[PDB]
Amino acid sequence: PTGTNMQLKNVAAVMVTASYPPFARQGQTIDVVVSSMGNAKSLRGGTLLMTPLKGVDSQVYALAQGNILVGG
Amino acid sequence: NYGYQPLFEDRRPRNIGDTLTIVLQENVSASKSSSANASRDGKTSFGFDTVPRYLQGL
């Protein structure tokens, strides 16, 4: 429902950045960097949900989803 | 494809066909006024109610 209070603690909004390599072909995999965006304490053992990586032209060039590795 | 779109720059119209919101707020009020006046009043009187005899010729 539109009018409701959700107060989550296990979810963080993040920005994912990656490099599109030369001569990249569909189906190949690349590394991504996940950075928190607002008042999140940690991203220790989180899992990145399906994220479309846009280019400068605002077109989806990659789809990101995986487990984050934080140093510790 | 839509071409380079910035990420932190505000959404402004850049090309032909882009839309922009105008908040029409006009309030013009001009005025002028002027006046002029003049007046002039005069009275004169001289009455020899009782003329002395040495002055009755004048």
From Swiss-Prot, chain A:
Highest taxon of the lineage: Bacteria
Cell location: Periplasm; Bacterial flagellum basal body
SUBUNIT field: The basal body constitutes a major portion of the flagellar organelle and consists of four rings (L,P,S, and M) mounted on a central rod.
UniProt record similarity statement: Belongs to the FlgI family.
Function per UniProt: Assembles around the rod to form the L-ring and probably protects the motor/basal body from shearing forces during rotation.
The protein's name in its UniProt record: Flagellar P-ring protein
Gene assigned in the entry: flgI
From Swiss-Prot, chain B:
UniProt-recorded name of the protein: Flagellar L-ring protein
Function: Assembles around the rod to form the L-ring and probably protects the motor/basal body from shearing forces during rotation.
Entry's family note: Belongs to the FlgH family.
Residue intervals passing through the bilayer: none
Assembly and binders: The basal body constitutes a major portion of the flagellar organelle and consists of four rings (L,P,S, and M) mounted on a central rod.
Highest taxon of the lineage: Bacteria
Subcellular location: Cell outer membrane; Bacterial flagellum basal body
SS bond list: none
